[PDB]
Amino acid sequence: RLLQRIKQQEDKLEETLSKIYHLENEIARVKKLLGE
Amino acid sequence: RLLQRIKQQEDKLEETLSKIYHLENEIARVKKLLG
Amino acid sequence: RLLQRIKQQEDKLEETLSKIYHLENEIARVKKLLG
């Protein structure tokens, strides 16, 4: 159970980071938009 | 507890994803506003 | 493995949460700097 759960958590965290990267990029463009 | 630590991490991750979901909505709204 | 992998995941998630925090702050500044 634990080995699989951990592998799943590692996969989920990587996909979670991907999401954050995208948002950080969204935030960057929005700020570029606003002029800063 | 390797067992409790993992359930802890799982719960944490779920809440983190809930936070991200909300932020996705916020930035999308801000983006629509800016045009 | 397992113990060294849960620790690494816990650190990773803490770093991620920090990113989320800064994100929330950035979106709170960008937005309602127009409202």
PDB file of N, CA and C in Angstrom:
ATOM      1  N   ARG A   1       0.826  -1.238   0.000  1.00  0.00           N
ATOM      2  CA  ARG A   1       0.000   0.000   0.000  1.00  0.00           C
ATOM      3  C   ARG A   1       0.847   1.269   0.000  1.00  0.00           C
ATOM      4  N   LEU A   2       1.713   1.395   1.002  1.00  0.00           N
ATOM      5  CA  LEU A   2       2.570   2.562   1.158  1.00  0.00           C
ATOM      6  C   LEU A   2       3.478   2.925   0.002  1.00  0.00           C
ATOM      7  N   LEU A   3       4.065   1.929  -0.652  1.00  0.00           N
ATOM      8  CA  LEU A   3       4.955   2.179  -1.787  1.00  0.00           C
ATOM      9  C   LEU A   3       4.197   2.827  -2.952  1.00  0.00           C
ATOM     10  N   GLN A   4       2.982   2.339  -3.190  1.00  0.00           N
ATOM     11  CA  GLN A   4       2.121   2.815  -4.267  1.00  0.00           C
ATOM     12  C   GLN A   4       1.547   4.205  -3.986  1.00  0.00           C
ATOM     13  N   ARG A   5       1.095   4.404  -2.748  1.00  0.00           N
ATOM     14  CA  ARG A   5       0.531   5.671  -2.270  1.00  0.00           C
ATOM     15  C   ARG A   5       1.563   6.790  -2.441  1.00  0.00           C
ATOM     16  N   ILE A   6       2.806   6.475  -2.081  1.00  0.00           N
ATOM     17  CA  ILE A   6       3.920   7.407  -2.165  1.00  0.00           C
ATOM     18  C   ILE A   6       4.250   7.743  -3.616  1.00  0.00           C
ATOM     19  N   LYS A   7       4.168   6.742  -4.490  1.00  0.00           N
ATOM     20  CA  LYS A   7       4.452   6.931  -5.905  1.00  0.00           C
ATOM     21  C   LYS A   7       3.365   7.817  -6.500  1.00  0.00           C
ATOM     22  N   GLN A   8       2.136   7.590  -6.046  1.00  0.00           N
ATOM     23  CA  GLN A   8       0.978   8.344  -6.489  1.00  0.00           C
ATOM     24  C   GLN A   8       1.068   9.790  -5.994  1.00  0.00           C
ATOM     25  N   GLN A   9       1.551   9.968  -4.768  1.00  0.00           N
ATOM     26  CA  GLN A   9       1.686  11.292  -4.189  1.00  0.00           C
ATOM     27  C   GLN A   9       2.777  12.076  -4.901  1.00  0.00           C
ATOM     28  N   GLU A  10       3.810  11.372  -5.351  1.00  0.00           N
ATOM     29  CA  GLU A  10       4.916  12.010  -6.056  1.00  0.00           C
ATOM     30  C   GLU A  10       4.479  12.444  -7.447  1.00  0.00           C
ATOM     31  N   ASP A  11       3.584  11.664  -8.046  1.00  0.00           N
ATOM     32  CA  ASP A  11       3.072  11.975  -9.372  1.00  0.00           C
ATOM     33  C   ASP A  11       2.124  13.162  -9.265  1.00  0.00           C
ATOM     34  N   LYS A  12       1.286  13.141  -8.235  1.00  0.00           N
ATOM     35  CA  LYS A  12       0.320  14.200  -8.010  1.00  0.00           C
ATOM     36  C   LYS A  12       1.003  15.526  -7.703  1.00  0.00           C
ATOM     37  N   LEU A  13       2.089  15.475  -6.941  1.00  0.00           N
ATOM     38  CA  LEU A  13       2.811  16.684  -6.583  1.00  0.00           C
ATOM     39  C   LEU A  13       3.483  17.318  -7.802  1.00  0.00           C
ATOM     40  N   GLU A  14       3.962  16.483  -8.717  1.00  0.00           N
ATOM     41  CA  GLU A  14       4.619  16.973  -9.921  1.00  0.00           C
ATOM     42  C   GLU A  14       3.600  17.662 -10.831  1.00  0.00           C
ATOM     43  N   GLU A  15       2.391  17.108 -10.876  1.00  0.00           N
ATOM     44  CA  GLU A  15       1.332  17.673 -11.692  1.00  0.00           C
ATOM     45  C   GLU A  15       0.831  18.943 -11.022  1.00  0.00           C
ATOM     46  N   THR A  16       0.919  18.967  -9.698  1.00  0.00           N
ATOM     47  CA  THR A  16       0.497  20.112  -8.912  1.00  0.00           C
ATOM     48  C   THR A  16       1.459  21.272  -9.165  1.00  0.00           C
ATOM     49  N   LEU A  17       2.747  20.952  -9.273  1.00  0.00           N
ATOM     50  CA  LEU A  17       3.778  21.955  -9.512  1.00  0.00           C
ATOM     51  C   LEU A  17       3.609  22.521 -10.907  1.00  0.00           C
ATOM     52  N   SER A  18       3.242  21.649 -11.834  1.00  0.00           N
ATOM     53  CA  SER A  18       3.030  22.055 -13.203  1.00  0.00           C
ATOM     54  C   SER A  18       1.950  23.146 -13.231  1.00  0.00           C
ATOM     55  N   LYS A  19       0.876  22.919 -12.479  1.00  0.00           N
ATOM     56  CA  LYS A  19      -0.238  23.860 -12.372  1.00  0.00           C
ATOM     57  C   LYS A  19       0.255  25.211 -11.871  1.00  0.00           C
ATOM     58  N   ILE A  20       1.058  25.179 -10.808  1.00  0.00           N
ATOM     59  CA  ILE A  20       1.611  26.383 -10.200  1.00  0.00           C
ATOM     60  C   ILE A  20       2.495  27.144 -11.182  1.00  0.00           C
ATOM     61  N   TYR A  21       3.271  26.412 -11.980  1.00  0.00           N
ATOM     62  CA  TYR A  21       4.152  27.031 -12.968  1.00  0.00           C
ATOM     63  C   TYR A  21       3.301  27.812 -13.953  1.00  0.00           C
ATOM     64  N   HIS A  22       2.211  27.188 -14.387  1.00  0.00           N
ATOM     65  CA  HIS A  22       1.305  27.808 -15.330  1.00  0.00           C
ATOM     66  C   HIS A  22       0.714  29.086 -14.756  1.00  0.00           C
ATOM     67  N   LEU A  23       0.219  29.011 -13.525  1.00  0.00           N
ATOM     68  CA  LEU A  23      -0.375  30.165 -12.866  1.00  0.00           C
ATOM     69  C   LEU A  23       0.649  31.285 -12.687  1.00  0.00           C
ATOM     70  N   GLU A  24       1.880  30.912 -12.344  1.00  0.00           N
ATOM     71  CA  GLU A  24       2.954  31.880 -12.152  1.00  0.00           C
ATOM     72  C   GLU A  24       3.187  32.606 -13.471  1.00  0.00           C
ATOM     73  N   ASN A  25       2.984  31.877 -14.560  1.00  0.00           N
ATOM     74  CA  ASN A  25       3.163  32.422 -15.884  1.00  0.00           C
ATOM     75  C   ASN A  25       1.992  33.330 -16.237  1.00  0.00           C
ATOM     76  N   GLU A  26       0.804  32.945 -15.774  1.00  0.00           N
ATOM     77  CA  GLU A  26      -0.418  33.699 -15.998  1.00  0.00           C
ATOM     78  C   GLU A  26      -0.284  35.027 -15.273  1.00  0.00           C
ATOM     79  N   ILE A  27       0.185  34.945 -14.028  1.00  0.00           N
ATOM     80  CA  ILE A  27       0.392  36.099 -13.161  1.00  0.00           C
ATOM     81  C   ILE A  27       1.441  37.037 -13.756  1.00  0.00           C
ATOM     82  N   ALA A  28       2.471  36.467 -14.377  1.00  0.00           N
ATOM     83  CA  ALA A  28       3.536  37.247 -15.006  1.00  0.00           C
ATOM     84  C   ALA A  28       3.010  38.057 -16.195  1.00  0.00           C
ATOM     85  N   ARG A  29       2.184  37.423 -17.042  1.00  0.00           N
ATOM     86  CA  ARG A  29       1.612  38.099 -18.211  1.00  0.00           C
ATOM     87  C   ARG A  29       0.653  39.192 -17.783  1.00  0.00           C
ATOM     88  N   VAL A  30      -0.147  38.895 -16.762  1.00  0.00           N
ATOM     89  CA  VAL A  30      -1.128  39.838 -16.240  1.00  0.00           C
ATOM     90  C   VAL A  30      -0.426  41.068 -15.676  1.00  0.00           C
ATOM     91  N   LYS A  31       0.769  40.862 -15.143  1.00  0.00           N
ATOM     92  CA  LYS A  31       1.534  41.947 -14.572  1.00  0.00           C
ATOM     93  C   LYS A  31       2.215  42.675 -15.705  1.00  0.00           C
ATOM     94  N   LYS A  32       2.596  41.932 -16.733  1.00  0.00           N
ATOM     95  CA  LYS A  32       3.250  42.517 -17.895  1.00  0.00           C
ATOM     96  C   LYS A  32       2.206  43.404 -18.573  1.00  0.00           C
ATOM     97  N   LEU A  33       0.966  42.933 -18.524  1.00  0.00           N
ATOM     98  CA  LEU A  33      -0.180  43.625 -19.082  1.00  0.00           C
ATOM     99  C   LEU A  33      -0.308  44.967 -18.362  1.00  0.00           C
ATOM    100  N   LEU A  34      -0.507  44.898 -17.048  1.00  0.00           N
ATOM    101  CA  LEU A  34      -0.649  46.075 -16.196  1.00  0.00           C
ATOM    102  C   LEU A  34       0.525  47.038 -16.331  1.00  0.00           C
ATOM    103  N   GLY A  35       1.646  46.543 -16.849  1.00  0.00           N
ATOM    104  CA  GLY A  35       2.804  47.397 -17.045  1.00  0.00           C
ATOM    105  C   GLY A  35       3.978  47.242 -16.102  1.00  0.00           C
ATOM    106  N   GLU A  36       3.907  46.284 -15.184  1.00  0.00           N
ATOM    107  CA  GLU A  36       4.995  46.066 -14.232  1.00  0.00           C
ATOM    108  C   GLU A  36       5.756  44.770 -14.511  1.00  0.00           C
TER     109      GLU A  36
ATOM    110  N   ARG B   1       5.366   7.732  12.545  1.00  0.00           N
ATOM    111  CA  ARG B   1       4.410   6.963  11.702  1.00  0.00           C
ATOM    112  C   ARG B   1       4.553   7.238  10.203  1.00  0.00           C
ATOM    113  N   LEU B   2       5.018   6.230   9.468  1.00  0.00           N
ATOM    114  CA  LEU B   2       5.180   6.333   8.024  1.00  0.00           C
ATOM    115  C   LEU B   2       3.771   6.337   7.449  1.00  0.00           C
ATOM    116  N   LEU B   3       2.851   5.776   8.225  1.00  0.00           N
ATOM    117  CA  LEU B   3       1.454   5.679   7.845  1.00  0.00           C
ATOM    118  C   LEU B   3       0.728   7.012   8.016  1.00  0.00           C
ATOM    119  N   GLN B   4       0.903   7.635   9.180  1.00  0.00           N
ATOM    120  CA  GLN B   4       0.275   8.921   9.481  1.00  0.00           C
ATOM    121  C   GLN B   4       0.912  10.060   8.683  1.00  0.00           C
ATOM    122  N   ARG B   5       2.222   9.975   8.473  1.00  0.00           N
ATOM    123  CA  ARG B   5       2.933  10.998   7.726  1.00  0.00           C
ATOM    124  C   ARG B   5       2.417  11.067   6.290  1.00  0.00           C
ATOM    125  N   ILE B   6       2.128   9.902   5.714  1.00  0.00           N
ATOM    126  CA  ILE B   6       1.640   9.809   4.343  1.00  0.00           C
ATOM    127  C   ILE B   6       0.201  10.303   4.199  1.00  0.00           C
ATOM    128  N   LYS B   7      -0.643   9.954   5.165  1.00  0.00           N
ATOM    129  CA  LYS B   7      -2.034  10.383   5.159  1.00  0.00           C
ATOM    130  C   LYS B   7      -2.045  11.895   5.330  1.00  0.00           C
ATOM    131  N   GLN B   8      -1.067  12.374   6.088  1.00  0.00           N
ATOM    132  CA  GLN B   8      -0.880  13.784   6.375  1.00  0.00           C
ATOM    133  C   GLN B   8      -0.535  14.523   5.081  1.00  0.00           C
ATOM    134  N   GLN B   9       0.418  13.953   4.351  1.00  0.00           N
ATOM    135  CA  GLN B   9       0.893  14.487   3.089  1.00  0.00           C
ATOM    136  C   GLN B   9      -0.235  14.503   2.068  1.00  0.00           C
ATOM    137  N   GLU B  10      -0.992  13.411   2.034  1.00  0.00           N
ATOM    138  CA  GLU B  10      -2.117  13.265   1.124  1.00  0.00           C
ATOM    139  C   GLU B  10      -3.150  14.344   1.365  1.00  0.00           C
ATOM    140  N   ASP B  11      -3.488  14.544   2.635  1.00  0.00           N
ATOM    141  CA  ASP B  11      -4.466  15.546   3.018  1.00  0.00           C
ATOM    142  C   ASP B  11      -3.937  16.927   2.650  1.00  0.00           C
ATOM    143  N   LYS B  12      -2.677  17.169   2.996  1.00  0.00           N
ATOM    144  CA  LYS B  12      -2.034  18.437   2.702  1.00  0.00           C
ATOM    145  C   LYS B  12      -2.107  18.729   1.209  1.00  0.00           C
ATOM    146  N   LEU B  13      -1.718  17.749   0.406  1.00  0.00           N
ATOM    147  CA  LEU B  13      -1.732  17.879  -1.039  1.00  0.00           C
ATOM    148  C   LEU B  13      -3.125  18.188  -1.585  1.00  0.00           C
ATOM    149  N   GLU B  14      -4.144  17.563  -0.998  1.00  0.00           N
ATOM    150  CA  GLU B  14      -5.518  17.779  -1.432  1.00  0.00           C
ATOM    151  C   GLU B  14      -5.922  19.235  -1.195  1.00  0.00           C
ATOM    152  N   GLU B  15      -5.597  19.734  -0.008  1.00  0.00           N
ATOM    153  CA  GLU B  15      -5.913  21.103   0.347  1.00  0.00           C
ATOM    154  C   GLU B  15      -5.135  22.077  -0.541  1.00  0.00           C
ATOM    155  N   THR B  16      -3.909  21.700  -0.892  1.00  0.00           N
ATOM    156  CA  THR B  16      -3.058  22.519  -1.739  1.00  0.00           C
ATOM    157  C   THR B  16      -3.699  22.639  -3.116  1.00  0.00           C
ATOM    158  N   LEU B  17      -4.238  21.529  -3.602  1.00  0.00           N
ATOM    159  CA  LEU B  17      -4.896  21.493  -4.894  1.00  0.00           C
ATOM    160  C   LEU B  17      -6.197  22.300  -4.886  1.00  0.00           C
ATOM    161  N   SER B  18      -6.816  22.400  -3.710  1.00  0.00           N
ATOM    162  CA  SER B  18      -8.047  23.150  -3.540  1.00  0.00           C
ATOM    163  C   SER B  18      -7.699  24.645  -3.605  1.00  0.00           C
ATOM    164  N   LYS B  19      -6.550  24.982  -3.022  1.00  0.00           N
ATOM    165  CA  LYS B  19      -6.038  26.343  -3.015  1.00  0.00           C
ATOM    166  C   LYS B  19      -5.751  26.755  -4.459  1.00  0.00           C
ATOM    167  N   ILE B  20      -5.066  25.873  -5.186  1.00  0.00           N
ATOM    168  CA  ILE B  20      -4.707  26.120  -6.573  1.00  0.00           C
ATOM    169  C   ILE B  20      -5.939  26.290  -7.450  1.00  0.00           C
ATOM    170  N   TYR B  21      -6.967  25.487  -7.191  1.00  0.00           N
ATOM    171  CA  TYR B  21      -8.205  25.553  -7.959  1.00  0.00           C
ATOM    172  C   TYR B  21      -8.773  26.961  -7.837  1.00  0.00           C
ATOM    173  N   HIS B  22      -8.810  27.444  -6.603  1.00  0.00           N
ATOM    174  CA  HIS B  22      -9.331  28.764  -6.323  1.00  0.00           C
ATOM    175  C   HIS B  22      -8.505  29.852  -6.989  1.00  0.00           C
ATOM    176  N   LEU B  23      -7.188  29.698  -6.960  1.00  0.00           N
ATOM    177  CA  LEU B  23      -6.295  30.670  -7.561  1.00  0.00           C
ATOM    178  C   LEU B  23      -6.466  30.694  -9.082  1.00  0.00           C
ATOM    179  N   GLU B  24      -6.745  29.529  -9.663  1.00  0.00           N
ATOM    180  CA  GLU B  24      -6.947  29.430 -11.101  1.00  0.00           C
ATOM    181  C   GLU B  24      -8.118  30.335 -11.463  1.00  0.00           C
ATOM    182  N   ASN B  25      -9.168  30.244 -10.659  1.00  0.00           N
ATOM    183  CA  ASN B  25     -10.373  31.032 -10.854  1.00  0.00           C
ATOM    184  C   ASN B  25     -10.101  32.532 -10.675  1.00  0.00           C
ATOM    185  N   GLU B  26      -9.342  32.882  -9.637  1.00  0.00           N
ATOM    186  CA  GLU B  26      -9.018  34.278  -9.363  1.00  0.00           C
ATOM    187  C   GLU B  26      -8.254  34.948 -10.504  1.00  0.00           C
ATOM    188  N   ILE B  27      -7.206  34.276 -10.982  1.00  0.00           N
ATOM    189  CA  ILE B  27      -6.373  34.787 -12.063  1.00  0.00           C
ATOM    190  C   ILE B  27      -7.149  34.848 -13.371  1.00  0.00           C
ATOM    191  N   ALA B  28      -8.060  33.898 -13.570  1.00  0.00           N
ATOM    192  CA  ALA B  28      -8.865  33.865 -14.787  1.00  0.00           C
ATOM    193  C   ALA B  28      -9.822  35.050 -14.787  1.00  0.00           C
ATOM    194  N   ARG B  29     -10.305  35.399 -13.601  1.00  0.00           N
ATOM    195  CA  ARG B  29     -11.216  36.518 -13.443  1.00  0.00           C
ATOM    196  C   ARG B  29     -10.459  37.817 -13.679  1.00  0.00           C
ATOM    197  N   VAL B  30      -9.267  37.905 -13.102  1.00  0.00           N
ATOM    198  CA  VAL B  30      -8.422  39.076 -13.249  1.00  0.00           C
ATOM    199  C   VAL B  30      -8.056  39.238 -14.724  1.00  0.00           C
ATOM    200  N   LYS B  31      -7.792  38.115 -15.382  1.00  0.00           N
ATOM    201  CA  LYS B  31      -7.428  38.126 -16.783  1.00  0.00           C
ATOM    202  C   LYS B  31      -8.582  38.614 -17.652  1.00  0.00           C
ATOM    203  N   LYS B  32      -9.792  38.143 -17.364  1.00  0.00           N
ATOM    204  CA  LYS B  32     -10.972  38.547 -18.125  1.00  0.00           C
ATOM    205  C   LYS B  32     -11.218  40.045 -17.928  1.00  0.00           C
ATOM    206  N   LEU B  33     -11.008  40.500 -16.697  1.00  0.00           N
ATOM    207  CA  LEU B  33     -11.185  41.896 -16.337  1.00  0.00           C
ATOM    208  C   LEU B  33     -10.257  42.779 -17.166  1.00  0.00           C
ATOM    209  N   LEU B  34      -8.986  42.398 -17.226  1.00  0.00           N
ATOM    210  CA  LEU B  34      -7.990  43.147 -17.979  1.00  0.00           C
ATOM    211  C   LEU B  34      -8.301  43.130 -19.476  1.00  0.00           C
ATOM    212  N   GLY B  35      -9.022  42.102 -19.919  1.00  0.00           N
ATOM    213  CA  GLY B  35      -9.390  42.000 -21.317  1.00  0.00           C
ATOM    214  C   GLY B  35      -8.382  41.338 -22.236  1.00  0.00           C
TER     215      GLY B  35
ATOM    216  N   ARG C   1      14.475   3.887   0.920  1.00  0.00           N
ATOM    217  CA  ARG C   1      13.487   4.447  -0.043  1.00  0.00           C
ATOM    218  C   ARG C   1      12.353   5.170   0.670  1.00  0.00           C
ATOM    219  N   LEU C   2      11.284   4.431   0.930  1.00  0.00           N
ATOM    220  CA  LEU C   2      10.083   4.953   1.575  1.00  0.00           C
ATOM    221  C   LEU C   2      10.206   6.106   2.569  1.00  0.00           C
ATOM    222  N   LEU C   3      11.110   5.999   3.534  1.00  0.00           N
ATOM    223  CA  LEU C   3      11.271   7.054   4.531  1.00  0.00           C
ATOM    224  C   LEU C   3      11.967   8.266   3.932  1.00  0.00           C
ATOM    225  N   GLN C   4      12.973   7.993   3.107  1.00  0.00           N
ATOM    226  CA  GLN C   4      13.732   9.037   2.446  1.00  0.00           C
ATOM    227  C   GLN C   4      12.880   9.671   1.335  1.00  0.00           C
ATOM    228  N   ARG C   5      11.839   8.964   0.900  1.00  0.00           N
ATOM    229  CA  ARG C   5      10.965   9.473  -0.151  1.00  0.00           C
ATOM    230  C   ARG C   5       9.817  10.294   0.413  1.00  0.00           C
ATOM    231  N   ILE C   6       9.409   9.981   1.647  1.00  0.00           N
ATOM    232  CA  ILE C   6       8.330  10.711   2.299  1.00  0.00           C
ATOM    233  C   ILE C   6       8.891  12.035   2.803  1.00  0.00           C
ATOM    234  N   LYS C   7      10.147  12.019   3.236  1.00  0.00           N
ATOM    235  CA  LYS C   7      10.798  13.222   3.723  1.00  0.00           C
ATOM    236  C   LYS C   7      10.957  14.201   2.563  1.00  0.00           C
ATOM    237  N   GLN C   8      11.450  13.684   1.444  1.00  0.00           N
ATOM    238  CA  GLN C   8      11.673  14.461   0.237  1.00  0.00           C
ATOM    239  C   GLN C   8      10.354  15.047  -0.295  1.00  0.00           C
ATOM    240  N   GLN C   9       9.259  14.313  -0.094  1.00  0.00           N
ATOM    241  CA  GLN C   9       7.943  14.747  -0.543  1.00  0.00           C
ATOM    242  C   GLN C   9       7.418  15.835   0.386  1.00  0.00           C
ATOM    243  N   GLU C  10       7.710  15.689   1.676  1.00  0.00           N
ATOM    244  CA  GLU C  10       7.290  16.653   2.684  1.00  0.00           C
ATOM    245  C   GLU C  10       8.001  17.991   2.472  1.00  0.00           C
ATOM    246  N   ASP C  11       9.277  17.932   2.108  1.00  0.00           N
ATOM    247  CA  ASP C  11      10.060  19.135   1.856  1.00  0.00           C
ATOM    248  C   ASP C  11       9.501  19.798   0.605  1.00  0.00           C
ATOM    249  N   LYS C  12       9.329  18.980  -0.432  1.00  0.00           N
ATOM    250  CA  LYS C  12       8.808  19.436  -1.701  1.00  0.00           C
ATOM    251  C   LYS C  12       7.473  20.142  -1.534  1.00  0.00           C
ATOM    252  N   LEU C  13       6.572  19.538  -0.764  1.00  0.00           N
ATOM    253  CA  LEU C  13       5.255  20.118  -0.536  1.00  0.00           C
ATOM    254  C   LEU C  13       5.317  21.416   0.260  1.00  0.00           C
ATOM    255  N   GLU C  14       6.319  21.539   1.125  1.00  0.00           N
ATOM    256  CA  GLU C  14       6.464  22.750   1.914  1.00  0.00           C
ATOM    257  C   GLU C  14       6.944  23.888   1.011  1.00  0.00           C
ATOM    258  N   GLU C  15       7.787  23.542   0.044  1.00  0.00           N
ATOM    259  CA  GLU C  15       8.318  24.502  -0.916  1.00  0.00           C
ATOM    260  C   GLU C  15       7.202  24.945  -1.841  1.00  0.00           C
ATOM    261  N   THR C  16       6.324  23.999  -2.169  1.00  0.00           N
ATOM    262  CA  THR C  16       5.198  24.244  -3.054  1.00  0.00           C
ATOM    263  C   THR C  16       4.218  25.203  -2.393  1.00  0.00           C
ATOM    264  N   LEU C  17       3.940  24.953  -1.121  1.00  0.00           N
ATOM    265  CA  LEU C  17       3.026  25.783  -0.354  1.00  0.00           C
ATOM    266  C   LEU C  17       3.532  27.225  -0.281  1.00  0.00           C
ATOM    267  N   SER C  18       4.853  27.381  -0.236  1.00  0.00           N
ATOM    268  CA  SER C  18       5.470  28.699  -0.190  1.00  0.00           C
ATOM    269  C   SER C  18       5.182  29.413  -1.510  1.00  0.00           C
ATOM    270  N   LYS C  19       5.244  28.656  -2.604  1.00  0.00           N
ATOM    271  CA  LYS C  19       4.984  29.191  -3.930  1.00  0.00           C
ATOM    272  C   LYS C  19       3.540  29.663  -3.996  1.00  0.00           C
ATOM    273  N   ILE C  20       2.634  28.847  -3.465  1.00  0.00           N
ATOM    274  CA  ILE C  20       1.208  29.166  -3.450  1.00  0.00           C
ATOM    275  C   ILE C  20       0.964  30.456  -2.676  1.00  0.00           C
ATOM    276  N   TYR C  21       1.656  30.585  -1.555  1.00  0.00           N
ATOM    277  CA  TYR C  21       1.544  31.746  -0.697  1.00  0.00           C
ATOM    278  C   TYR C  21       1.901  33.032  -1.453  1.00  0.00           C
ATOM    279  N   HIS C  22       3.042  33.006  -2.139  1.00  0.00           N
ATOM    280  CA  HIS C  22       3.523  34.143  -2.911  1.00  0.00           C
ATOM    281  C   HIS C  22       2.574  34.442  -4.060  1.00  0.00           C
ATOM    282  N   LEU C  23       1.959  33.389  -4.591  1.00  0.00           N
ATOM    283  CA  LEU C  23       1.016  33.506  -5.690  1.00  0.00           C
ATOM    284  C   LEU C  23      -0.224  34.229  -5.185  1.00  0.00           C
ATOM    285  N   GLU C  24      -0.728  33.800  -4.033  1.00  0.00           N
ATOM    286  CA  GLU C  24      -1.904  34.415  -3.437  1.00  0.00           C
ATOM    287  C   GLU C  24      -1.653  35.898  -3.178  1.00  0.00           C
ATOM    288  N   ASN C  25      -0.429  36.212  -2.773  1.00  0.00           N
ATOM    289  CA  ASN C  25      -0.042  37.582  -2.479  1.00  0.00           C
ATOM    290  C   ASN C  25       0.029  38.433  -3.747  1.00  0.00           C
ATOM    291  N   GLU C  26       0.565  37.840  -4.808  1.00  0.00           N
ATOM    292  CA  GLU C  26       0.712  38.514  -6.088  1.00  0.00           C
ATOM    293  C   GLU C  26      -0.635  38.829  -6.727  1.00  0.00           C
ATOM    294  N   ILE C  27      -1.560  37.874  -6.641  1.00  0.00           N
ATOM    295  CA  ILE C  27      -2.893  38.020  -7.203  1.00  0.00           C
ATOM    296  C   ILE C  27      -3.731  38.961  -6.359  1.00  0.00           C
ATOM    297  N   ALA C  28      -3.374  39.091  -5.083  1.00  0.00           N
ATOM    298  CA  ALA C  28      -4.096  39.969  -4.167  1.00  0.00           C
ATOM    299  C   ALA C  28      -3.654  41.413  -4.382  1.00  0.00           C
ATOM    300  N   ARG C  29      -2.442  41.568  -4.897  1.00  0.00           N
ATOM    301  CA  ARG C  29      -1.887  42.880  -5.168  1.00  0.00           C
ATOM    302  C   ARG C  29      -2.326  43.323  -6.560  1.00  0.00           C
ATOM    303  N   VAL C  30      -2.111  42.466  -7.560  1.00  0.00           N
ATOM    304  CA  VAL C  30      -2.481  42.769  -8.941  1.00  0.00           C
ATOM    305  C   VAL C  30      -3.955  43.138  -8.989  1.00  0.00           C
ATOM    306  N   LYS C  31      -4.775  42.293  -8.386  1.00  0.00           N
ATOM    307  CA  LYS C  31      -6.206  42.510  -8.347  1.00  0.00           C
ATOM    308  C   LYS C  31      -6.484  43.372  -7.138  1.00  0.00           C
ATOM    309  N   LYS C  32      -7.548  44.156  -7.202  1.00  0.00           N
ATOM    310  CA  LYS C  32      -7.879  45.040  -6.105  1.00  0.00           C
ATOM    311  C   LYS C  32      -6.658  45.931  -5.919  1.00  0.00           C
ATOM    312  N   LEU C  33      -6.362  46.522  -7.069  1.00  0.00           N
ATOM    313  CA  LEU C  33      -5.325  47.481  -7.395  1.00  0.00           C
ATOM    314  C   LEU C  33      -6.091  47.833  -8.674  1.00  0.00           C
ATOM    315  N   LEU C  34      -7.364  47.438  -8.630  1.00  0.00           N
ATOM    316  CA  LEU C  34      -8.349  47.622  -9.688  1.00  0.00           C
ATOM    317  C   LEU C  34      -9.721  47.194  -9.151  1.00  0.00           C
ATOM    318  N   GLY C  35     -10.111  47.726  -7.997  1.00  0.00           N
ATOM    319  CA  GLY C  35     -11.400  47.364  -7.433  1.00  0.00           C
ATOM    320  C   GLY C  35     -11.638  47.906  -6.040  1.00  0.00           C
TER     321      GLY C  35
END
